[PDB]
Amino acid sequence: TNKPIVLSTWNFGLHANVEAWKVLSKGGKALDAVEKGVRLVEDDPTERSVGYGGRPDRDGRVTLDACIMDENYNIGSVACMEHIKNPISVARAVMEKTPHVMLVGDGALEFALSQGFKKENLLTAESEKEWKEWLKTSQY
Amino acid sequence: TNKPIVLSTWNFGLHANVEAWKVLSKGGKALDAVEKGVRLVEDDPTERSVGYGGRPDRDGRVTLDACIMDENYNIGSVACMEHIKNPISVARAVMEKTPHVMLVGDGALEFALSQGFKKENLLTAESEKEWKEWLKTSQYKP
Amino acid sequence: CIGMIALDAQGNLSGACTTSGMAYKMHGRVGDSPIIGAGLFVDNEIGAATATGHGEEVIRTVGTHLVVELMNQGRTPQQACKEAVERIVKIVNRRGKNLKDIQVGFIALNKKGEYGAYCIQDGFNFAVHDQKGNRLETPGFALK
Amino acid sequence: CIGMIALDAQGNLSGACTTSGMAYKMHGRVGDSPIIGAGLFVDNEIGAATATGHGEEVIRTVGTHLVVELMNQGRTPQQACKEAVERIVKIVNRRGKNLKDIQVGFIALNKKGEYGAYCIQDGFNFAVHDQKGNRLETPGFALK
Ligand SMILES: CC(=O)N[C@@H]1[C@@H](O)[C@H](O)[C@@H](CO)O[C@H]1NC(=O)C[C@H](N)C(=O)O
Ligand SMILES: CC(=O)N[C@@H]1[C@@H](O)[C@H](O)[C@@H](CO)O[C@H]1NC(=O)C[C@H](N)C(=O)O
């Protein structure tokens, strides 16, 4: 048995893996390792397809989707949630703190706020700039 | 092969099957039959677990979920959508009229309005009454 | 929630699932009814299935996708629904929950027009209409 | 989107998936990333898988649930990802679409810590870290 071990998608997964390994190499839970690992990307504004710095929907709104699943079929999910930088952690709270497994839209934000997460502006100057250039080319 | 044939969940599925059969018995598409079939329940304000007349969330908002899938992997879905009586048909429009397969929340309503669906009050007097009684026993503060 | 699956005269399958969800749910709560693979799944080369009951549990086990893959592996609609229910049962147990608190049902149909159903607890019926007529049937259940 | 799956020292699996979704998507659009069985699926007795690429296609085929059920049937992580991708290829064709417009990939891990990955098109890579260290690997792909 080759353990511990972690796999993640794309080039930036190499960096996310380093964070997950800080947990895995010390005997920590896979659940903690994958949350910490992906939060790194959510936090980084230069990672434009995850959390902070994510390119918005056509209307200029940054809406995030995330889900988490542990070793015993417990699951949590948030979709189309705005203003919260770490949706993977809100998904973990949906899993651990509610009798539900999926919250979306306004209710997902409301639940996040109730859990102490802070409302932040996820739209970076760079993402806003690109969004506006897309509006010109697409003529939307 | 036993066909055409239609199955639906719960006792009110019997009455819903009759609608679907109006399509199936004349050789119509399964897709049309299942949409027509469930719309009957969505339209019925006395069936409180589907569409109009649905019991609201704990804050008194009626939000609907629905999805549809045809014979060739085409899919459409809407979740947590308000004010539209027939979410199954908005799901069908998502499938046929957009490059996406799932819209939720405000975005789902905007799309429905753009497709000509009419905004309506899905909360009935009966459901509102029951909701308020639940607030009393549960003691939840909306 | 009402889930409906059908096989038409052309021999084609389709399905629909629509609900107002769990009464008094948290704002923004979404169950299995709009999730492909959970509340509803259709594969024209195999069959179709739709689920009802506590949506959280159907999502957790990706229920209808499971039912259809079981039919793909050789089970009759009936056997597939039963094996699928039995998986939710084992998982409910692994999660230290009490089966009495959960209700999940599946109804399925294959390309031959054969159909079946199964549920965790008694009380669930489904309606079936074919050329012989429309009828209310009661499937077997696990919690006896 | 980033998807991550791991097997810890206790031999337990878990996974996480998070994204800002398709750039300039319609307001309210949801991809595969928050859908259990689509963007992510974990079963501690079998293995885990996560998907990336065009979300709509992963939802359509309930991709990761498929990958894990294949591992359950006996496939290695690698074979499970390959067959799953090959199912999206057949469906893409049945729907009259062009594979070149579609990118889907899966990475998977089983209880033994064996892993695998496969995708529709060249160009995707994934990072794997075990006791031999951290590295970027390239999976096979179907469109050649
Ligand atoms: C758990 C639940 O709400 N079950 C409802 C059941 O009591 C009722 O008899 C039937 C038909 O009216 O609807 C059920 N609702 C669901 O199926 C819930 C849905 N699957 C979901 O959102 O999870
Ligand atoms: C199809 C797509 O958007 N691919 C994105 C890819 O270009 C990018 O390199 C990676 C990581 O930055 O993210 C991909 N995004 C997705 O996988 C989309 C997600 N699965 C969804 O919501 O559909």
Q: Give the whole-angstrom CA distance, residue A15 versus residue D71.
A: 28
Q: Is residue A46 within 6 Å of ligand 2 at its C-beta?
A: no
Tokens of C138: 């009661």
Tokens of D119: 């995708």
Task: Tell me if residue B104 falls in helix, strand or coil.
Answer: strand
∠ CA B117-B123-B126, rounded to 5°: 145
Q: Give the whole-angstrom CA distance, residue D64 versus residue D77.
A: 11
Q: Give the whole-angstrom CA distance, residue B113 versus residue D69.
A: 40
Chain C residues with CB inside 8 Å of B37's CB?
Answer: 4, 6, 16
Q: Is residue D102 within 6 Å of ligand 2 at its C-beta?
A: no
Q: Backbone phi, then psi, for A7, in 5-degree steps?
A: -125, 140
Q: Give the whole-angstrom CA distance, residue A3 versus residue A69.
A: 19
- Binding-site residues, ligand 1, Cβ < 6 A: B 10, 49; C 1, 19, 21-22, 31-33, 52-55
The conformation of residue A129, written as its DSSP 8-state character, comes to H
Q: Give the whole-angstrom CA distance, residue B135 versus residue C116.
A: 39
User: Across-strand partners of C140?
Assistant: C118
Q: Give the whole-angstrom CA distance, residue A133 versus residue A56.
A: 13
Q: Backbone phi, then psi, for D62, in 5-degree steps?
A: 45, 50
Q: Give the whole-angstrom CA distance, residue B5 versus residue B17.
A: 9
Q: Are D33 and D24 in contact (CB under 8 A)?
A: no
∠ CA D125-D127-D128, rounded to 5°: 130
Q: Backbone phi, then psi, for B108, in 5-degree steps?
A: -65, -45
The conformation of residue C29, written as its DSSP 8-state character, comes to B
Classified by CATH at the fold level, domain C1-144 comes out as Glutamine Phosphoribosylpyrophosphate, subunit 1, domain 1 (3.60.20)
CA-only gyration radius of chain A, Å: 16
Amino acid at D129: H
Residue partners of D82: CB distance under 8 A and separation at least 6: D116, D118, D140
Mutate to test the pocket of ligand 1, among C52, C54, C59, C136 (most ligand atoms within 8 A of CB): C52
**Length of chain D, in residues:** 144
Long-range contacts of C130-133 (CB under 8 A, 24+ apart): C130/B2, C130/B3, C130/B4, C130/B5, C130/B6, C131/B2, C131/B4, C131/B5
Distance C22 CA to ligand 1 centre (A): 6
Q: Are residues D38 and C36, on separate chains, in Cβ contact within 8 Å?
A: yes
Q: Give the whole-angstrom CA distance, residue A126 versus residue C106.
A: 48
Pick the closest to residue A95 from A81, A115, A80 (CA basis): A115
- B·D CB contacts under 8 A: 42
Method: X-ray
Chain A residues with CB inside 8 Å of C23's CB?
Answer: none
- Domain extent for B53: 1-142
Torsion sign (Cα): D15, D6, A21, D119: negative
Give the number of other CB atoms < 10 A from CB of residue C62: 29
Q: Is residue D1 within 6 Å of ligand 2 at its C-beta?
A: yes
Q: Give the whole-angstrom CA distance, residue A40 versus residue C134.
A: 57
The per-residue DSSP string of A75-98 comes to: EEEEEEE-S-S-HHHHHHHHHHHS
Tokens of A15: 């960096």
Residue partners of D96: CB distance under 8 A and separation at least 6: none
Q: Are B7 and C128 in contact (CB under 8 A)?
A: yes
The verdict on C65 touching D (C-beta cutoff 8 Å) is yes
Ligand 2 atom having least distance to the Cα of D39: 20
The verdict on B96 touching D (C-beta cutoff 8 Å) is no
CA-to-CA separations, A19 to A24, A35, A117, C52, in angstroms, rounded: 9, 9, 21, 40
Q: In this structure, which residue's CA is closest to atom 5 in ligand 2?
A: D53
The per-residue DSSP string of A89-123 comes to: HHHHHHHHHSS-SEEEHHHHHHHHHHTTPPP----
Tokens of D69: 């059920």
Nearest to B103 among D29, D59, D94 (CB): D29
Pick the closest to residue D1 from A44, A47, B16 (CA basis): A47
Ligand 2 atom having least distance to the Cα of D30: 22
Strand arrangement of the beta sheet that strand D104-110 belongs to: D40-43, D47-53, D104-110, D115-121, D140-143
Ligand 1 atom having least distance to the Cα of C54: 1
CA-to-CA separations, B105 to A106, A140, B83, C51, C53, in angstroms, rounded: 8, 21, 11, 23, 23
- Ligand showing the shortest atom-to-Cα distance for residue C60: 1
Residues 76-95 of B with CB under 8 A from C: 77-80, 87-88, 91
Q: Is D87 exposed, middle or buried (0-12, 13-18, 19+ CB in 10 A)?
A: middle
The conformation of residue C100, written as its DSSP 8-state character, comes to G
Pick the closest to residue C17 from B17, B38, D31, B41 (CA basis): B38
Q: Are A65 and B107 in contact (CB under 8 A)?
A: no
Breaks (C-N over 2.5 A) in chain D follow: none
Q: What is the three-state SS of chain D?
A: CEEEEEECCCCCEEEEEEECCCCCCCCCECCCCCCECCCEEEECCCEEEEEEECHHHHHHHCHHHHHHHHHHHCCCHHHHHHHHHHHHHHHHHHCCCCHHHCCEEEEEEECCCCEEEEEEECCCCEEEEECCEEEEECCEEEEC
Torsion sign (Cα): A42, A44, A48, A53: positive
Q: Are A83 and A121 in contact (CB under 8 A)?
A: yes
Task: Tell me if residue B105 falls in helix, strand or coil.
Answer: helix
Q: Are B32 and C30 in contact (CB under 8 A)?
A: no
Number of structural domains (chain B) is 1
Strand arrangement of the beta sheet that strand B64-69 belongs to: B102-104, B75-81, B64-69, C13-19, C2-7, B5-9, C126-130, C133-137
The conformation of residue B126, written as its DSSP 8-state character, comes to H
The reply to whether omega before A4 is within 30° of 0 (cis) is: yes
The verdict on A99 touching C (C-beta cutoff 8 Å) is yes
